[PDB]
Nucleic acid binder design. Structure first.
Lengths: 59, 44, 51, 97, 24, 253, 93, 125
RNA sequence: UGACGGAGCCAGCGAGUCUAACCUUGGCCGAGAGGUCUUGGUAAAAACUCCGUCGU
């Protein structure tokens, strides 16, 4: 996933956080990618599409 | 060229490395149109 | 036989890093190493705090 | 009983006589194998010759080819921030504490 | 010049004239 | 010729050339393009096959000036051997490659390196449609280094018969000379169109203007179809610009 | 070698340190190896290119001495050379 | 119907199918003559059967081999196994069994892999 | 027990209407939203066998 975060430091704060798509597919922030900054790896309960949008709920 | 030149090289060859007990060495129209397009966009 | 002289640094210190001909090159290498340790240390700490 | 029949300096470069003309001229910076072949072809110097075998006029012609390529229609192609990042990292570390 | 296999040939073929053929 | 007579076109070119010397960002800009606002949609889908616009008065370039890449049909032995041996074409091409070898040796970053090294790319018309997958996106957006269709020999194809494979070195050289001296354009299904008309530091302003008139005459002349006469209904306006500079109007209806 | 800066151990310069190591200071003489190298390398046989020297350190390190080398004559400089060699694993011209 | 037999040779993932019928000594591998099999260095390997029993036996038969899978070496071994098995089977089916016994004896005496498959099955220890 | 080029040729896994760039220069249409075109830069089977060239 891209555009969620600006640097790999931000991703590290949110690793393990719950995320989901607009479709409702639930996932997790697994790890930050070294290249490029702000990208990260996630695992979802099912395969997602390129047209999907992932959202992290925070308060 | 001159024969003197060859004598110098010959003698230098005799004189021509550590030996004995030697130690190793020590150490404005364009600006107008840019404005014009900017003016058109802001006006719209 | 030809004779050559050994090349060595006096008062050699292995832990101390090699001398560099260029001060800027060493200095930037100095800062690049400093950045790496701090980034890895901060990244470790933020993960532990998050966990 | 009477029968009558090693290093050269070209373009400020020493070239071995033993080496063939084209691969001897390859040693010159900016001169490739294809470039040297083309230069020799323009110079009408037999490529099978060794660099030592070259006569003075042939060497002069080769030098003229090298120095005046466009004149002989040679093709053209043949011719602080880290500190700022450290400070930002330190600021992030301080904010973490 | 037309090639049925490649219709794109007939457009965008470099025109050739006498001056092009004659050696420089 | 009315555009050439107008002083506005002269004034725009003087300002454009002056800026490139003044502005550091435009230092690497060397080519001059004209943007034509055709009145109505051309209706031609972009086929990525360049069309040659003959510039009679002046020549933009010569083959010896540019790095030329030739992409040939497999096997490339017949074409590579014939072109290299012939005196006319012995030194015309920087590199001769086949499609299959081209796909194998150049991938990823190597394609980017291939883009920079070569100024002109030409390919056998039979393999032109394969190149977009091989050369990649970089070659095929912007129109700067699109491959040109060329024909190796004057033989023609007849249905139910097999084309004889031959390489005519003089014919290949003649086509390449035409491609380099003449400018080119690619049709698109919209008003805008870009054509290269001049090169900075090489063409004087009067020469660049003449190239524009030849470009406009050829594109508007219905008698030159299908290669020309594509701008039906006149031209609303014409601009001039470099790769990174802004558009300077030179004609407006 | 041993850090104080690293120095080649000697029987005279470093006695207390060897006692901490427990090694007997009688067998702490690198000067003998220096003296043999000077006479071996400066002998005419070496000048004729018919001699090569090896050194088996007590610890178990094997050193190959190129016949061309010119080791410093003063012992103090030689010690600086060995700490360079034992750590860098090679010496260049 | 023309008398014909079919046999298989296997080596790792390489599989060769040999069809042996009555004919005039026409031996092909993958639609090309056996002499063009590659690599050339191992060509005599695929000649092992023919030279062991002699070319006179092949003079009255045509052999067609189709090979798929594996690499060069395993394909060579598949070809030779298939050819040997095909010759033996054809001699069983349409020629006396005495000659078959001689063929089997020759192939087994030289190299048993020509007839029996060589597969290195794992064996835990 | 090299580099370059060419030529010959050999696998087995793997099939969700799903598979996938970024940053710019400008033309036109559009009340807006936006749409379309243009443009430069950045990123992104092999072994094996044979033949030819240089040469350690």
């Amino acid at each position: 996933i891209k555009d969620m975060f600006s640097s790999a430091m931000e991703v590290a704060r949110f690793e393990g956080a719950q995320i989901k798509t607009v479709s409702g597919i639930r996932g997790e922030i697994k790890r930050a990618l070294s290249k490029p900054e702000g990208h990260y790896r996630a695992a979802f309960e099912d395969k997602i599409l390129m047209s999907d949008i992932v959202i992290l709920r925070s308060w | 060229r001159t024969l003197r030149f060859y004598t110098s090289k010959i003698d230098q060859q005799e004189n021509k490395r550590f030996k004995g007990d030697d130690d190793i060495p020590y150490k404005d129209y364009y600006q107008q149109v840019q404005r014009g397009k900017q003016d058109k966009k802001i006006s719209r | 036989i030809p004779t050559h002289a050994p090349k060595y640094e006096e008062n050699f210190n292995p832990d101390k890093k090699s001398y560099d001909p260029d001060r800027t090159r060493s200095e930037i290498n100095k800062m690049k190493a400093q950045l790496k340790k701090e980034r890895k240390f901060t990244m470790k700490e933020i993960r532990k705090d998050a966990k | 009983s009477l029968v009558v029949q090693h290093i050269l300096r070209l373009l400020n470069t020493n070239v071995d006589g033993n080496i063939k003309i084209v691969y001897a001229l390859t040693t010159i910076k900016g001169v490739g194998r294809r470039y040297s072949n083309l230069v020799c072809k323009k110079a009408d110097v037999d490529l099978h010759k060794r660099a030592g075998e070259l006569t003075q006029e042939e060497l002069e012609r080769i030098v003229q080819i090298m120095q005046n390529p466009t004149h002989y229609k040679i093709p053209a192609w043949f011719l602080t921030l880290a500190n700022n990042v450290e400070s930002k990292l330190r600021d992030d570390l301080e904010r973490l504490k | 010049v037309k090639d049925h296999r490649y219709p794109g040939l007939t457009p965008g073929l470099a025109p050739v004239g006498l001056s092009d053929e004659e050696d420089s | 010729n009315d555009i050439i007579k107008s002083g506005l076109a002269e004034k725009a070119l003087k300002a454009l050339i002056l800026q490139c010397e003044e502005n550091p960002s435009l230092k690497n800009d060397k080519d001059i393009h004209i943007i034509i606002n055709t009145g109505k949609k051309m209706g031609i889908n972009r086929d990525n096959i360049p069309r040659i616009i003959p510039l009679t008065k002046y020549k933009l370039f010569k083959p010896r000036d540019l790095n030329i890449l030739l992409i040939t049909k497999d096997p490339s032995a017949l074409y590579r051997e014939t072109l290299t041996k012939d005196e006319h074409t012995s030194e015309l091409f920087k590199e001769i490659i086949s499609v299959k070898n081209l796909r194998r040796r150049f991938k990823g970053s190597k394609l980017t390196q291939l883009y920079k090294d070569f100024d002109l790319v030409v390919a056998d018309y039979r393999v032109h449609h394969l190149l977009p997958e091989v050369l990649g996106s970089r070659f095929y957006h912007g129109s700067k280094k699109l491959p040109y269709m060329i024909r190796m020999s004057k033989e023609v194809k007849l249905k139910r018969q097999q084309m004889v494979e031959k390489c005519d070195p003089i014919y290949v050289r003649a086509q390449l000379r035409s491609i380099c001296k003449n400018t080119s354009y690619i049709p698109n299904n919209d008003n805008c169109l870009s054509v290269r008309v001049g090169y900075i530091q090489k063409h004087s302003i009067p020469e660049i203007l003449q190239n524009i008139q030849d470009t406009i005459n050829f594109l508007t002349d219905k008698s030159k179809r299908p290669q020309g006469g594509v701008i039906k209904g006149g031209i609303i306006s014409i601009f001039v610009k470099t790769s990174n500079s802004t558009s300077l109007p030179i004609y407006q209806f | 070698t041993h850090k104080i800066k690293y120095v080649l151990l000697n029987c005279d310069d470093h006695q207390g340190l060897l006692k901490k190591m427990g090694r007997d200071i009688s067998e702490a003489r690198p000067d003998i190896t220096h003296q043999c190298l000077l006479t071996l390398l400066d002998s005419p046989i070496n000048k004729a290119g018919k001699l090569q020297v090896y050194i088996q350190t007590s610890r178990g390190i094997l050193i190959e001495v190129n016949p061309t080398v010119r080791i410093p004559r003063t012992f103090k400089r030689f010690s600086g050379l060995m700490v360079q060699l034992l750590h860098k694993l090679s010496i260049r011209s | 119907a023309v008398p014909s037999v079919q046999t298989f040779g296997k080596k790792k993932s390489a599989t060769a199918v040999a069809h042996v019928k009555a004919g005039k000594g026409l031996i092909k591998v993958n639609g090309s003559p056996i002499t063009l099999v590659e690599p050339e260095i191992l060509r005599f390997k695929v000649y092992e059967p023919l030279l062991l029993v002699g070319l006179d036996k092949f003079s009255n038969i045509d052999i067609r081999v189709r090979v798929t899978g594996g690499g060069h070496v395993s394909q060579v071994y598949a070809i030779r196994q298939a050819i040997a098995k095909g010759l033996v089977a054809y001699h069983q089916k349409y020629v006396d069994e005495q000659s078959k016994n001689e063929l089997k004896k020759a192939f087994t005496s030289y190299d048993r892999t020509l007839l029996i498959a060589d597969s290195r099955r794992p064996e835990p220890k």
